[PDB]
Amino acid sequence: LRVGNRYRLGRKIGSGDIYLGTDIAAGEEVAIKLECVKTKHPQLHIESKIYKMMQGGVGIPTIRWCGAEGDYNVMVMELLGPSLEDLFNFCSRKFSLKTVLLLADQMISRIEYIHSKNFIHRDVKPDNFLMGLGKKGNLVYIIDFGLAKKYRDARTHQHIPYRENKNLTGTARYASINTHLGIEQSRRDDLESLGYVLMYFNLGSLPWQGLKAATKRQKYERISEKKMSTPIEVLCKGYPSEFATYLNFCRSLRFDDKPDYSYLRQLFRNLFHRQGFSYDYVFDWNMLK
Numbered sequence: 001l002r003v004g005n006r007y008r009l010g011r012k013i014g015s016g017d018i019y020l021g022t023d024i025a026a027g028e029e030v031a032i033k034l035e036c037v038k039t040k041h042p043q044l045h046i047e048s049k050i051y052k053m054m055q056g057g058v059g060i061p062t063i064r065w066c067g068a069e070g071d072y073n074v075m076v077m078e079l080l081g082p083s084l085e086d087l088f089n090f091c092s093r094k095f096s097l098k099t100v101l102l103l104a105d106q107m108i109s110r111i112e113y114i115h116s117k118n119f120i121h122r123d124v125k126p127d128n129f130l131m132g133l134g135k136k137g138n139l140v141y142i143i144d145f146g147l148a149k150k151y152r153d154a155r156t157h158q159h160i161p162y163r164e165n166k167n168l169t170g171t172a173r174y175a176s177i178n179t180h181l182g183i184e185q186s187r188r189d190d191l192e193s194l195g196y197v198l199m200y201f202n203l204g205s206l207p208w209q210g211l212k213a214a215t216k217r218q219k220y221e222r223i224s225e226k227k228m229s230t231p232i233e234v235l236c237k238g239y240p241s242e243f244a245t246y247l248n249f250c251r252s253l254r255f256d257d258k259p260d261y262s263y264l265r266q267l268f269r270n271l272f273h274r275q276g277f278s279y280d281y282v283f284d285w286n287m288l289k
């Protein structure tokens, strides 16, 4: 099937749905997202607006083409490689400290870039970071802007108001404590969620993971309470203190504070050097012969 002028649509990749495609003109694989012109939640075109505003950033997927063909709204992106969730599963849910610290450095920088563009992500989780392919295989990219929201006025840098009593939109496992309290998400929240993702990679799971409950709202209750009853020093026991210092600093941030991204990268960098590691982008999965 013929999309745009120059894109050939292949079978599904996974996840509307995601498809393998070919830029017939340039001889390069691409990824395509189709959305029916009928949906009770039209998303792609709004999501595509945000991807367009991120273009040019390190580790932002390049938009090849946006448009409509037949029944569908269409976005085409350069092809990327497997997610951190997919690589974590492929590695038996065990990452070395070096890998976690290599990831952490880049992941902080992606989040910082998104914030520089007046947005917060609000779905920071392993699925929403992808490694590149080929010459870009040492590069962590970030995806999925379907839950993203402006946190400040583009022009007047006016932060959004402190709001309360909200529903949890996102992934409960990585949500901030303040998110569980029903407080408006801001820059601090994206970083705290990263903090939990990093401890996830260290541990293989999180302690509030796989709690049984009769219903959904009950499960979220249990996750919230488990998080709020697990001290940071307990979550992080047996791992370098930096992971605790990182989360404590995130939990200390005020609603409208600009995070010291630099401080957080330096934290992991100092530990990196103390362990005698080198920023040669050799991740655990690069050593599978």
Ligand SMILES: Fc1ccc(-c2ncn(Cc3ccncc3)c2-c2ccnc3[nH]ccc23)cc1
Binding pocket: 013, 014, 015, 018, 031, 032, 033, 061, 075, 076, 077, 078, 079, 080, 081, 083, 130, 143
């Ligand atoms: F225009 C778009 C918008 C979003 C996607 C996408 N959504 C999720 N993924 C990751 C995924 C998909 C299916 N199974 C596992 C992981 C992609 C995606 C996949 C591969 N390479 C890509 N490069 C840019 C996005 C993307 C794809 C095209």
